[PDB]
Amino acid sequence: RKLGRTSSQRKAMLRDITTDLIINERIVTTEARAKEVRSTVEKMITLGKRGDLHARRQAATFVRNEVASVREEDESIVVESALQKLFNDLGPRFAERQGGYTRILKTEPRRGDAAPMVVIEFV
Amino acid sequence: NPLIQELTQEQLRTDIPAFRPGDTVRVHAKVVEGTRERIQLFEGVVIKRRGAGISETYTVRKVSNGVGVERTFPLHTPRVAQIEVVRYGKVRRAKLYYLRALHGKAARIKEIRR
Amino acid sequence: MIQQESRLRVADNSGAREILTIKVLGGSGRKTANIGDVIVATVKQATPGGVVKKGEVVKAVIVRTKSGARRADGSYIKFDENAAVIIRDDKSPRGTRIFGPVARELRENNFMKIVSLAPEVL
Amino acid sequence: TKGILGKKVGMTQIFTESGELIPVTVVEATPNVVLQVKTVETDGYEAIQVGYQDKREVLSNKPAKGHVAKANTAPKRFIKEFKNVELGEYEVGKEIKVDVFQAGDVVDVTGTTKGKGFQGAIKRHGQSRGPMSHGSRYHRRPGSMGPVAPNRVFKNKRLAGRMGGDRVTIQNLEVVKVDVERNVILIKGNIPGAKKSLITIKSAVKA
Amino acid sequence: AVPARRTSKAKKAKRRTHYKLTIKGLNACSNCGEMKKSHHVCPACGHYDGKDVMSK
RNA sequence: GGCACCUCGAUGUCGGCUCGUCGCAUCCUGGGGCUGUAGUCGGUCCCAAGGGUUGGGCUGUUCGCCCAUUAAAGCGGCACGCGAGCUGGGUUCAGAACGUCGUGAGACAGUUCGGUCCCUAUCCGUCGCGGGCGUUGGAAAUUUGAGAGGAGCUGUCCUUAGUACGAGAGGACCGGGAUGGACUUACCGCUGGUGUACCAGUUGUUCUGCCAAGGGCAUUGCUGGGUAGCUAUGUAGGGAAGGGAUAAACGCUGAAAGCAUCUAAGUGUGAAGCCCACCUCAAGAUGAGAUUUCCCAUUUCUUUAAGAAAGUAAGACCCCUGAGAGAUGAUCAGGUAGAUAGGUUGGAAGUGGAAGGCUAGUGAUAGUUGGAGCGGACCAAUACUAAUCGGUCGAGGACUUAAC
RNA sequence: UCUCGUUAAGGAACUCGGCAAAAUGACCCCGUAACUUCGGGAGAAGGGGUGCUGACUUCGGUCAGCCGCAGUGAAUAGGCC
């Protein structure tokens, strides 16, 4: 593994990054956080493939509690809390694809620190 | 790992019954005096287990004349003739280290008829 | 692992109760001592009566350490205490009764007059 | 004389015929082709080249496959020599199975030590720290560097620098089994090297 | 301690020789023939592996 | 002790700590001669520096007295070794007191209590690790050993034998065998330690609308276990046996000196010491070594010379996935001719009985569905993701003489 | 190098000197010496209990039962002679 800070700070940083990239399917950050987050995200999508209680109540600790995602209305305001998304949209979208569902792209360093940045996608 | 197992099957004794830490166990050891071969009888409480394959081990905790004693044996010895569970006790830990500070009427474990 | 300035116990009917080691005879600077190795100690506490008293220099032997020897087969012994049994330079004890088990490793050292008195020889 | 290379798998135990556990490591091996015979009249001494593993084909170059193919094998990974062996008795392209060490019982394994990176001057020499309290400030350092008169530092004062990574041999170890059907030896004791390293075993030197 | 002399003009260079700055790994892109860094997304073309990536 | 050449634009004292090193006028082990040496012990002298030479009590202590061991508890040099490496206790600041001296302010190698020790390594030096070039065509590998380093310690028991010895008393040389002490080289299968992205219990308080289930914070909240990795007090081995030339000493043969006499000519024995034997580094050994295999030729002329330039072979490097390696660089495993890492499906170590239900209870809770649920580094299997496309460098082999 | 956490067996052998760390630490109950200026020493020493559920609560608490290795379960909070 790769530490960046103390323990609990790293845990919170990952529980942050993998909650985006659930909502946007794309993210532009550095190189190391990329590798650790691809591991974590792929490990938190197999839980989207069981869909029962126990997988629900185990996934429900590695996701920022409530982060709305609303692009829908029929005559209503439907709200999707970025976990319900995990169990409603990403899940049924990977049934036949087995492990390994993220792409990492090495783009270009940054202005102030020359930290070689990177992208992350899903298909 | 797989290449060793194939090298270490012919020496795995195969009559050891089931017993999890917390079961009184009588152990028929093997002793050697002069040119004889007696058979001792160490008999206590199973305390430990080092899950290892060929080299799993266990320990027993007797109390003789007010002085605790412990012996640990390899699980696959040829110099142990037999083992025989006697009871079964309610217990919630996998390492009962917390006994060495308890005496008599406080270090008893409830029985289970199973 | 029993070295200088450490406290054994008397497992005998000789008159002493505690003890504090002095040396680990045998070698030219040895540190420790295990089951069945001789020792030089001087009484610290004592019961009234007895042939042994405070401030006496005596030799003793180590029975049942708290990290016991290994058996050549692959088993171990690990008691709960340490203890010693006083001696007269001829492997012959002074007291006339022994309490508490003793480990087997004495039979290999001509300490016979002891084992014939131990209630349990583990 | 009797020489075999091989890998290093790990360690386990084994009971002997008298109820006595024995630590034992697992030197694995495979057949291996003698590659070249060096003679007095051509190379100044007598020795034998050997090699214990099989490369792919992508991972070599025309010199290697032109130096091996005089014995018709796949190109090898390791290549070593041996001396004091009764030469005779041999051919280009023969083999050396694990048979030669039936119960030789005396053998001198060599190999390459582990690796431990830049290290202090205590994990390399057993030098003792200074009093960690009573107001001192000399916990973990390499001592003094010598006297004053010579106005220089004598050779062989020992201080920090990479630890481990150089070869070393042990002597007078036994052998316990030879499972020719799988090409595995089993010796008594600890043997140096990391897992999957390269090991060599020859007969004893001290008779 | 503290220097016991000024360093000559020569020693200054003879020590600075190993103070360089090399750039490495420059490739010709495949859609615009311009120089790009191997294993890296083309900044001007936007493409990679003959495919477009940077799009929305 | 003497002298006052040396240092006043400042050359810091004793002991103890870490670290050594050298001389022998030798403390133990090794070889010897003489004895007022029966034996076991011993006395002295000679050769010999290879290794080894302890824990603690009392004082600031060197010094010393004492206790307990051991083969032995050596003497000295190195700014009475070592403070830009440590301590500052001691003697030498400002406070204060006792005894004595001085009318006094103060003093006393007399005593008692307290008291500030700074420094970011430039050069050489030592420990490790890279880049450049050389070795006369360009490359991939395997080795010889001129030299250098390491290592060298020793007890106890049994048998030989209750013999030789001796009145008894007591008790061997030379041999054979077993097992220890200290020291030291490697490793994690056993016993143990650690193990902050592993498992369980439990307090407070706050958050996810509430009950149920969970997160946040409190030294990782505290407590009980613990995988891989790194580890010693754990495991395994080591100083074995020999050779050659010598030291003190002992001869053989033999004269100068019809004898005697180891010596001048001749010829031997002889020690932990010298040189080999054991382990490691080593061709920048510019006296730059040896062997196996691989790759074989354009343009103008400077003028044909050891000419200049361009494109290639063998190969190497750049770039990317990594670790059995790692401060960076290096070494090693791989780069679609693919298991290098991630992921996925199994499996193991490890915890120790998941959630949701149901039965028994008024309730705490208990039983059952089930060796369950979870499971970082470990073992297998699979190209789902990423090692794409690419680029740079890299020879065309001088002369003289002999032989063939 | 500094600031922290853990440790087998031994427990002052370190050291000028237990300096530094470790150990005790809350509330309720029992009990407590020499010595004395009679006020004190005295929180002397040395010991016991604490969680949850139900019943009875005269009032304080008493009974019964349940679980854990550990019940002021974390932080705060005299070492003694």
Ligand SMILES: [Zn+2]
């Ligand atoms: Zn482009």
